[PDB]
Amino acid sequence: GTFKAKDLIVTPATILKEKPDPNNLVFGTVFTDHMLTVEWSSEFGWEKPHIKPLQNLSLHPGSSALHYAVELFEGLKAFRGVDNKIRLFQPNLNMDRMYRSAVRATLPVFDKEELLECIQQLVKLDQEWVPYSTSASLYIRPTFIGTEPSLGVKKPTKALLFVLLSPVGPYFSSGTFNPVSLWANPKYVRAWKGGTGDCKMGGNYGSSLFAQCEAVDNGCQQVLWLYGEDHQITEVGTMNLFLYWINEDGEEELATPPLDGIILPGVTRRCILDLAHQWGEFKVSERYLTMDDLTTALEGNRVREMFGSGTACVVCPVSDILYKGETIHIPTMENGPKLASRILSKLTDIQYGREERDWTIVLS
Amino acid sequence: GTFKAKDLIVTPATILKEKPDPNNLVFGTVFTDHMLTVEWSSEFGWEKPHIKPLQNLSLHPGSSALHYAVELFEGLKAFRGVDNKIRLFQPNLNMDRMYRSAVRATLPVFDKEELLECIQQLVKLDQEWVPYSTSASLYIRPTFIGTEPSLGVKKPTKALLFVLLSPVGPYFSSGTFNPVSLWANPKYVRAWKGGTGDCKMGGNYGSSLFAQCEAVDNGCQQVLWLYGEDHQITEVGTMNLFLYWINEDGEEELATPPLDGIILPGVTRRCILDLAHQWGEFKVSERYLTMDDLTTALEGNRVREMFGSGTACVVCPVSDILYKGETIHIPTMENGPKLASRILSKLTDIQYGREERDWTIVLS
Ligand SMILES: Cc1ccccc1Oc1cc(-n2c(=O)cc(C(F)(F)F)[nH]c2=O)c2ccccc2c1C#N
Ligand SMILES: Cc1ccccc1Oc1cc(-n2c(=O)cc(C(F)(F)F)[nH]c2=O)c2ccccc2c1C#N
Ligand SMILES: *Cc1c(COP(=O)(O)O)cnc(C)c1O
Ligand SMILES: *Cc1c(COP(=O)(O)O)cnc(C)c1O
Numbered sequence: 001g002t003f004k005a006k007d008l009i010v011t012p013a014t015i016l017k018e019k020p021d022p023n024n025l026v027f028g029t030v031f032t033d034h035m036l037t038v039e040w041s042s043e044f045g046w047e048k049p050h051i052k053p054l055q056n057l058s059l060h061p062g063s064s065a066l067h068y069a070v071e072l073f074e075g076l077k078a079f080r081g082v083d084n085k086i087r088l089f090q091p092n093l094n095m096d097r098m099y100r101s102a103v104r105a106t107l108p109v110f111d112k113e114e115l116l117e118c119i120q121q122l123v124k125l126d127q128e129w130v131p132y133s134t135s136a137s138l139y140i141r142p143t144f145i146g147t148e149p150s151l152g153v154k155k156p157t158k159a160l161l162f163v164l165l166s167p168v169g170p171y172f173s174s175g176t177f178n179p180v181s182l183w184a185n186p187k188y189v190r191a192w193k194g195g196t197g198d199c200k201m202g203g204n205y206g207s208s209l210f211a212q213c214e215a216v217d218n219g220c221q222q223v224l225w226l227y228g229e230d231h232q233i234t235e236v237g238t239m240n241l242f243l244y245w246i247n248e249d250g251e252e253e254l255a256t257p258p259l260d261g262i263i264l265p266g267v268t269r270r271c272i273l274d275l276a277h278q279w280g281e282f283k284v285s286e287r288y289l290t291m292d293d294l295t296t297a298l299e300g301n302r303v304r305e306m307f308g309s310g311t312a313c314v315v316c317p318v319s320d321i322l323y324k325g326e327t328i329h330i331p332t333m334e335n336g337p338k339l340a341s342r343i344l345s346k347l348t349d350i351q352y353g354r355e356e357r358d359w360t361i362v363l364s
Numbered sequence: 365g366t367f368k369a370k371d372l373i374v375t376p377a378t379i380l381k382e383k384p385d386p387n388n389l390v391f392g393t394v395f396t397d398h399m400l401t402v403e404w405s406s407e408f409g410w411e412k413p414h415i416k417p418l419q420n421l422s423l424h425p426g427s428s429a430l431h432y433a434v435e436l437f438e439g440l441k442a443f444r445g446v447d448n449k450i451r452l453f454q455p456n457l458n459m460d461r462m463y464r465s466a467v468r469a470t471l472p473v474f475d476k477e478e479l480l481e482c483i484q485q486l487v488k489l490d491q492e493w494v495p496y497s498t499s500a501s502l503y504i505r506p507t508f509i510g511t512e513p514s515l516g517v518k519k520p521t522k523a524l525l526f527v528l529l530s531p532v533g534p535y536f537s538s539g540t541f542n543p544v545s546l547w548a549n550p551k552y553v554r555a556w557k558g559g560t561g562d563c564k565m566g567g568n569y570g571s572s573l574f575a576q577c578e579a580v581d582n583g584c585q586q587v588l589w590l591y592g593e594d595h596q597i598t599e600v601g602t603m604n605l606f607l608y609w610i611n612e613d614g615e616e617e618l619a620t621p622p623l624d625g626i627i628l629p630g631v632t633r634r635c636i637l638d639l640a641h642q643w644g645e646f647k648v649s650e651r652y653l654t655m656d657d658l659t660t661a662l663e664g665n666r667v668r669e670m671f672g673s674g675t676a677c678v679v680c681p682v683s684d685i686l687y688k689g690e691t692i693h694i695p696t697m698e699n700g701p702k703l704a705s706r707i708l709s710k711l712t713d714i715q716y717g718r719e720e721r722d723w724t725i726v727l728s
């Protein structure tokens with residue numbers, strides 16, 4: 001039916017590993033002492049969850065995750081506050097998105113309240129892995145995979161749900177904004193209408209690696225995802241895309257693409273539109289933006305700031321775009337960046353407990 | 365570099381499993397005594413291949429195949445002939461397609477001649493699993509996965525290449541053409557231009573399970589994949605699509621969609637075009653076909669036969685399509701099916717050694 005947090009079986013590790021130095025962390029390469037596992041079958045339903053030492057998984061080579069990408073994931077953080085209390089940030093929005101993605105993958109449904117409480121107990125046991133730095137955090141990685149030992153393409157009769165914990169340094173080791181260059185080639189598409197691009201399913205990511213390898217060979221750090229005959233700008237790598245500018249009607253506007261099927265609905269993207277509506281100092285539009293809209297705006301000095309948004313960066317400014325043989329400069333870093341700074345400081349003030357907020361949950 | 369077939373290390377099993385009855389067999393559920401494994405790293409290149417007892421894989425929970433679908437596969441058969449010689453059918457076209465898919469997924473390349481000879485030693489050791497029946501076969505499943513223990517989205521520095529063996533019955537246990545109904549819903553899209561739909565990469569398949577669940581709920585046996593504002597017919601499930609008809613210009617024609625990036629280039633699709641070109645008895649077009657093209661043709665009595673093609677079926681005739689709330693009948697089974705029968709009998713005669721061919725390899 002569903003596993004229950006109150007049925008948790010806890011098997012502690014006998015020897016603990018030494019914590020790495022917080023200002024030399026490489027994202028997702030170091031892992032904590034413990035993981036969570038929960039097994040499912042169609043014959044016997046959900047087994048009882050386990051909290052046990054990190055270990056390798058024992059998989060049948062026939063497992064449908066390794067053959068037909070029957071798999072999905074999530075990404076959220078835990079923050080050690082300035083009062084030394086550990087907090088989660090909008091974790092219910094992550095659980096909601098994981099459930100929607102499971103239905104679209106035909107993985108078995110689960111109680112969202114029971115997963116989050118299991119996850120809370122996993123961080124509570126391993127709580128010293130949450131760094132003693134207000135520029136560092138602990139990444140939480142829920143993962144859900146088909147483990148059906150057969151090659152037939154179908155809805156799986158077996159599955160594992162597991163959670164990893166990995167400490168991460170600041171995205172900007174400098175401590176202030178390093179702007180990124182983008183590779184813009186219309187030859188590749190990330191996601192299409194009628195597709196799965198608005199879910200965090202593994203198969204959306206496997207196909208982007210060739211494009212990223214090409215971006216790096218041409219000196220860029222990320223891909224700018226183009227879509228359709230009018231070259232709509234959609235996403236920046238695995239981050240949502242925002243543009244602060246004077247629009248076509250002469251009005252100061254913050255703009256992001258709409259949730260029309262090809263966009264991942266980011267927790268950060270939701271948080272930033274809510275803040276922009278509350279401040280009410282400028283227009284806020286979920287609308288379509290093209291390479292023509294952007295180059296026409298730069299000719300008339302109308303562009304202020306371009307930045308990516310996600311759990312990775314919070315905010316990630318853009319300085320240039322390579323497109324049809326030329327480098328196009330974006331004046332983000334010559335305009336402050338005023339809005340990008342204000343956003344970074346507000347969201348970190350909420351994350352690290354410098355102000356009270358509906359958006360945070362203290363670990364009990 | 366590459367692994368080398370002459371470096372093979374063989375560890376035979378001490379206890380062997382009992383062979384299933386060939387007159388049952390459910391696709392991809394029974395596995396042989398032995399598997400092939402080859403390890404790679406960026407640091408030390410390709411390790412030596414192994415032939416050893418079937419076993420579970422031991423993967424780090426961080427492995428890039430379980431998170432970002434860094435994975436691809438192939439599918440080909442071995443046939444026990446009427447002279448009791450075991451044969452492979454066009455296995456060089458499977459190796460060519462595996463190499464192309466590896467490059468597009470950023471997995472390491474390998475020597476195609478070395479993999480095939482390792483595969484031949486695998487089937488030769490387990491040659492009694494190749495069924496004693498001219499309606500049965502041994503399915504061969506090469507698989508290639510990223511095993512990088514890290515959450516970073518990038519090209520893997522670690523990988524496993526492995527091969528599974530599974531005996532399978534005839535597609536239709538009766539041994540005669542059961543025609544299939546197709547579910548045609550344009551809200552699902554299999555593949556887009558600028559994507560990976562022309563490679564056998566895992567992420568292309570994970571997305572299709574919900575659409576197939578819906579097809580079965582409405583009484584159909586496969587999905588008809590529609591594309592674009594004009595509703596182009598592309599593929600039938602995981603089979604290529606063929607239409608035998610009088611075209612617009614009054615000419616007898618065999619038609620199939622072009623290789624413009626949203627079609628998997630089937631081995632059977634290759635084999636069927638080569639046969640049609642050789643016979644020189646009617647026109648052969650790789651062209652676009654829409655639902656309008658089809659319903660205009662049916663109104664004018666111009667359609668003869670529609671069928672799927674692949675390793676699964678060889679040829680799979682179509683009797684109906686459900687589209688915009690109506691059932692549309694295709695007269696495949698009232699026209700013989702003459703062409704579908706001629707194709708099935710030629711390709712099976714070559715697979716089971718009832719005539720000599722360029723397209724087959726006797727096992728050494
Ligand atoms: C949002 C998201 C979606 C899917 C998987 C992981 C995700 O989160 C992260 C992604 C990251 N990443 C990469 O892994 C790789 C590149 C690349 F494009 F440069 F290759 N960019 C990147 O932002 C990170 C890089 C450094 C520190 C943290 C992260 C991070 C977090 N937290
Ligand atoms: C496994 C596979 C993946 C990608 C491409 C081709 C593939 O080959 C096969 C696919 C099969 N299949 C399914 O697994 C599932 C449905 C579904 F649509 F009905 F769900 N149809 C099906 O033909 C088969 C069904 C019965 C006997 C053999 C195969 C088969 C072989 N050989
Ligand atoms: C995860 C992700 C985002 C941002 O989501 P957050 O919830 O803000 O971390 C954006 N685009 C893609 C493609 C993603 O996978
Ligand atoms: C494998 C496959 C086919 C059939 O290819 P064959 O090599 O003839 O078995 C057709 N369409 C898709 C999408 C496939 O994956």
Ligand SMILES: [Mg+2]
Pocket residue numbers: 111113
């Ligand atoms: Mg409940």
